[PDB]
Design an enzyme around this catalytic site. Structure first.
Site, PDB file in Angstrom:
ATOM      1  N   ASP B   8      15.679  16.663  19.968  1.00 40.04           N
ATOM      2  CA  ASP B   8      15.345  18.013  20.658  1.00 40.04           C
ATOM      3  C   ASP B   8      15.455  18.883  19.387  1.00 40.04           C
ATOM      4  OD1 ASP B   8      14.217  16.711  22.810  1.00 40.04           O
ATOM      5  OD2 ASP B   8      15.484  17.977  24.173  1.00 40.04           O
ATOM      6  N   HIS B 162      19.996  15.483  19.974  1.00 36.77           N
ATOM      7  CA  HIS B 162      19.636  16.757  18.929  1.00 36.77           C
ATOM      8  C   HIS B 162      19.882  16.622  17.569  1.00 36.77           C
ATOM      9  CE1 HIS B 162      19.512  18.958  23.151  1.00 36.77           C
ATOM     10  NE2 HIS B 162      20.260  17.854  23.114  1.00 36.77           N
TER      11      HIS B 162
HETATM   12 ZN   LIG Z   1      16.316  22.062  23.583  1.00 36.66          ZN
END
Ligand SMILES: [Zn+2]
Ligand SMILES: CCNC1=N[C@@H]2[C@@H](O)[C@H](O)[C@@H](CO)O[C@@H]2S1
Ligand SMILES: CCNC1=N[C@@H]2[C@@H](O)[C@H](O)[C@@H](CO)O[C@@H]2S1
Ligand SMILES: [Zn+2]
Ligand SMILES: [Zn+2]
Ligand SMILES: [Zn+2]
Lengths: 206, 205, 205, 206
Positions: B8, B162
């Site tokens: 992400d 992430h």
């Molecule tokens: Zn996010």
């Protein structure tokens, strides 16, 4: 190493001692976020919560979003609410719970003030939704509220959001306790010693 | 026994690093990119697709109120889709909602997305990498690996990571071998292969 | 194997008739009276207690918005209680909420009722006597009796009737005969014997 | 002989087509109360509901309380709604279903006006509460709503309140149909010639 943190919001209330006995009879500990008007009306129950082995943290004075986040009164109300709570139990707790949750009220602005004030913030990983079941039999409400909680616990830790100010909530905690224990959860309270971030902003400063 | 890595908030500073780490292990993953990161890192975007990963969307502003409370979600996802279409010449369908779809993605917005032609993916496993930020990278990463290896239980799993976070990228190597010996193989999302992975259990997405 | 007949919205025109019918069958029931009907028929009020029936409260205005939406419930019950007390020398505790307690009697008002010392009773069986109003009585009543006889299955039953209705009072004889054959006995509510019967399953009432 | 009368409020809407098909699998008939703007946008679905065996009645134009009751446009909005429904299915239905129910909106004034125009009025005996289940996984909501209607079928006739315009609602209908059918219910539409009163005011003129 499964630990359930049952949290109870907006208290204390007229169902709280009842919840407090059911907690006690299950030798299970939990954590309570209280409103300033209720810490004042119910000072004994506060003192008792703490006395029976539970974390008592803040949840503001007004529980007013506009006041809390748009005008940024949040920490002021958590500091005032803190003072009341100290006067009763001798501790100045540091963990806060945002009314309506930190998302999106807790902007980067006051999220700073929160850490610059030494406070801490906890949202939740399960939302019992207990407070919506207010239009049906209370036993039926309790089963659905426990069903919700029992079927959403999976992660090594879970922070369960409940409010001890609605009957259907405190009636669900017997089932919830018996259920999660069968799932191998321990029912401990929050300890400041062992803090770990739980919020929607993923901001591990708080 | 498929296993889908998702990343992400990228592409970012360590994305370049990560794509190589994946490459060595013959591993294909999925990226959900923010609009501005597409504008700033077109090369990385182009490269991600070229090396066989899926390139999906994660919106323009990553802003909860704008996205959900004001219903800009699909608009933000389509515009992000446009920016991505200008690099890879493909227009992806898969959206990953910022902060997850629960409760942000209401019954109405869930119509707009099905109507708009999009799918939605949340995850099953949270790497929890954000906890260990601005922290000693190898120590953090090590934990993140445990965080995902332990909750790897189901036949298929969709893992949230992430790649704008160093501890996360560092964690990826240890995860890759640890999961592969658990009988898992690492595939990218494929649009013709769509199956529901959303908190609402909404199977139209 | 008890069966508690209850009558609402009275006392009225047929109340005396009913009391004889109850009396003739050596049967005791429960009445929930509206304030103004207490004000108009004190003798009937007086008679009900005198012959061994329970005399409870059914509010002052029988107005939904006032009672619940405006929270006047307890107050209306309190004032109704007093009016009854001036006749029978007791202050009864058992209330029967106009229109049932669901959903009108919210969590807040349910506290007040508990605090004021009141109980609340709904029913298990609905006679549906109001369907057959202003209708050929002999025919109507027969049906109404059957309506309750069919639903007579549980060990305890609380039957909703209205003695302000002729078809209902007319129905009462057959119920008394029909339930006696089902092994039922007909007792009035007694406060020391209180047990919860409320749609909310709220066991404080 | 038991009969469950499924009623669906506030449609037609985007999940209606799926509900219509799910009804058709269990050879089950039901009742639809519709809002004017929705009959304007989804006439196939109106036309079809009708054509497929169900009753279609009014649920007003605006679904606004202060307009319906405090301003007394109930009969006005039901006739106007009736007009629309007629131009689609060639029928002027007489049965209406009040938004937010008859109690306390339909005062005696409005209730006289209702019988003045040959209308009937149906409230309900089971409130599924489907529309309050919009904050959880739809399958979970579907289940709870089912249990709500399954564990409240006691009376030989039940009129069950649902809203076909929410997903968790039509999702629950399969389990509802299996459930009641197990308890010996049949799933009819309302029939005009077969009218029996069901209202909160116990007024059997409607
Ligand atoms: Zn996010
Ligand atoms: C879109 C509204 N969001 C929410 N409403 C609830 C509030 O009533 C609670 O007080 C809050 C904190 O206890 O948790 C949820 S969150
Ligand atoms: C004070 C009662 N409020 C109610 N809200 C629900 C409404 O959203 C529905 O539209 C109505 C009729 O369809 O049924 C219930 S009742
Ligand atoms: Zn709160
Ligand atoms: Zn009454
Ligand atoms: Zn409605």
């Amino acid at each position: 190493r499964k630990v359930a943190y049952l949290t109870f919001d907006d208290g204390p209330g007229k169902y709280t001692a009842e919840l407090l006995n059911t907690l006690k009879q299950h030798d299970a500990k939990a954590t309570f976020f209280l409103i300033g008007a209720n810490v004042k009306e119910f000072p004994d129950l506060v003192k008792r919560e703490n006395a029976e082995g539970h974390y008592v943290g803040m949840h503001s004075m007004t529980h007013n979003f506009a006041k809390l986040y748009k005008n940024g009164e949040y920490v002021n109300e958590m500091k005032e609410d803190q003072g009341l709570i100290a006067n009763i139990i001798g501790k100045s707790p540091k963990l806060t719970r945002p009314p309506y949750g930190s998302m999106p009220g807790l902007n980067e602005g006051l999220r700073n003030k929160v850490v610059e004030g030494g406070f801490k913030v906890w949202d939740w990983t399960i939302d019992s939704l207990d407070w919506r079941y207010n239009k049906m039999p209370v036993d039926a409400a309790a089963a659905q509220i426990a069903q919700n909680v029992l079927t959403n616990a999976t992660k090594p830790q879970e922070v369960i959001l409940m409010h001890d100010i609605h009957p259907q909530s405190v009636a669900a905690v017997p089932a919830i306790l018996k259920g999660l224990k069968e799932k191998g959860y321990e029912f401990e309270a929050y300890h400041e010693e062992s803090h770990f971030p739980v919020n929607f902003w993923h901001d591990n400063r708080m």
